Amino acid sequence: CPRFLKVKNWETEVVLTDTLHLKSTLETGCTEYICMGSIMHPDVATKDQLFPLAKEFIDQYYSSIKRFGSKAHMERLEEVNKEIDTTSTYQLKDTELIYGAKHAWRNASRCVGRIQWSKLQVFDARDCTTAHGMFNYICNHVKYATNKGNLRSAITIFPQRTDGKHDFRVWNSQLIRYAGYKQPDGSTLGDPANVQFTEICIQQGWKPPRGRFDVLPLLLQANGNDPELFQIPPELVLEVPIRHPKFEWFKDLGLKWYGLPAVSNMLLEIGGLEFSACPFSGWYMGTEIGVRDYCDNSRYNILEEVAKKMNLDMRKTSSLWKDQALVEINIAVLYSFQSDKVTIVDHHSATESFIKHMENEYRCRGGCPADWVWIVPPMSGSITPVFHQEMLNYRLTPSFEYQPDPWNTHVWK
């Protein structure tokens, strides 16, 4: 690989130089002859696999605190090596855990919100042993991160994987999501993205209200045991009813959304250790709700009803009735969150912040891996500055990774 790589911004002519790609660890999926940049997704570590992975992370940590090569650095290396020898695994210090989690966010090429990466509140839940205890930790996470609408980014980290038969898992894909119910006639009530998980909950004992916006229960697995159901206390679930500053009829659509986006199905990898339950939360970019959740055809799919109430001609695509309604929906989402004082960022502000963040990372870190396909927002892409910014994508560790859905792998007791 070449030592310096240049990226250009085609609207400002700014050229940045990346050297950080030389620390790339895992594979992108691309080759010299094919690029998999738009592919959405392109039994443990042995003692011998673990040694070099831990040393790499420990070296990186001691370099970050300006103590590389120090007595404490060499001592930590030796203590980790011994621990891997006698137990075939090792435990992270609290300092290392916090550094690792922050950097997994810093390295997340698909995240436009990373200017905030260093202000992550890390909750250490490695002492947790039961699903009730997981429920307690998650309730505390939700209450802290919500903060009455002044949202704060946070992560809660449950015990790492050991032999793969004792995984901690949150079976929910996000901590707060709405149920979906398939009907005998083929229609769907609620959120069509969550139909599979809803059916699982119902099979596990959940009594479904069968409404349009039913907060799903938590389904929590500790130490490889069968998962258990818990209802989040509704006073902890902050929600925003959606209304429009101009269209009085918009509130009559009965739409609302939850304030806290909190991913709970990813895997956090630090120094070769695997934290399979590590729910993390931030705050929304408006388009995640107003474009994807609401206007995706396989989601709530409200473009038609909004367009009807806007009295647009919906017979010709070239009237751009979809585009016109999509903007108003996103105007309403941003207006409703700001009116209720719940943190939210519009796509113009977020992408301008990300450009400033990326320039700082190139200057102070030597690069910033970024996945253009994910960074550019799903509406008005080219009137945001990220559209014109060349990006390099590569995988640094620590990182957040996808993992198989737990119902596909769990050995029922």
Added chain:
Amino acid sequence: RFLKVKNWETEVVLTDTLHLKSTLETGCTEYICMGSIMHPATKDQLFPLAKEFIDQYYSSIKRFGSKAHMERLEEVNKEIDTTSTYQLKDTELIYGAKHAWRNASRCVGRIQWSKLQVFDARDCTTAHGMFNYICNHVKYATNKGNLRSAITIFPQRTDGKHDFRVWNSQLIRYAGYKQPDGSTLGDPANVQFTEICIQQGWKPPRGRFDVLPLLLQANGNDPELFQIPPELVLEVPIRHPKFEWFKDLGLKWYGLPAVSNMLLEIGGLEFSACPFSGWYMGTEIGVRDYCDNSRYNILEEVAKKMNLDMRKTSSLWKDQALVEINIAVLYSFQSDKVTIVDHHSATESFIKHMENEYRCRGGCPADWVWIVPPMSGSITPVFHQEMLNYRLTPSFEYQPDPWNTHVW
């Protein structure tokens, strides 16, 4: 290995085998993806490239290994020997030009690829000849508004000192003028090219929509200026179907999009002058040409006339104005019966095209970064379509601007 692509909206899965036929590089490696980077012979090298292309041509007409196939291979071999190059048959030129379009991973309009009028201009020797060929192209492709796809192919490169080049980036474009007070009148994308035309003698009208002259280089000589006859240049005044004040913005655009700075590569031969044209997708004018900060940059003016609150980004005033501008563009072209396609229809056609190509050909190289439209991405079907990008030949390639290589 067989590679699968999934559409996440329809859950349709396609299987790609065609990528096994590529050997040009993408720029990516196993460790770094450059998918959002815009730009990442001899007798010795020529014959294998020639043979590959002849092979796929005779394989395409189902006479692979025929006597005609055998004879052409040896004919081409003797010619690369005795002349250091070779000349394509007419049938081969047409096939190679259609397939360069079919292979253009960044083009959402490829459902049309085999409806392409190919104009053979390989006997051209002077800039006057190029001008005549180009005027004929423009008149044919414009067709009084019923636009027809076309390409004109000038003589191939020989030693690199005798290149044919269209110095314009598109056949029809608007001049851009650096103002004394610091700003820009016209189109800022073209400020440099406009200055070169003035430096070469063109008398600029210093307006907002001044059609640039053609600047044409033949056989490596200095380029020459030519005015396209105005009756050949079809233009559309932009008005809005509800905002009657929109026409008072004074906006217009040309109907014929015609790229003239790329390089066409067929069987290892390089055609440095190959202007090709089709018809517009509305967002090309309404989103990029009008609203890029480094282009005409009219969002502020439009949002003014709509009386939108412009103090905070979160009112989405930019997004509102953007949609109205794009409604006006489509409405104006359609009212004047000038061919144009909206991004919803275009991307729908491209998904259908992908389906056709997977069935009959085993895949379709496609660049998601370029295929997805610059507005309303995820409400178009391409947003949810996984795509494999790879380089098949014949192809269109970028080349350096001639004013950085030419010696006068």
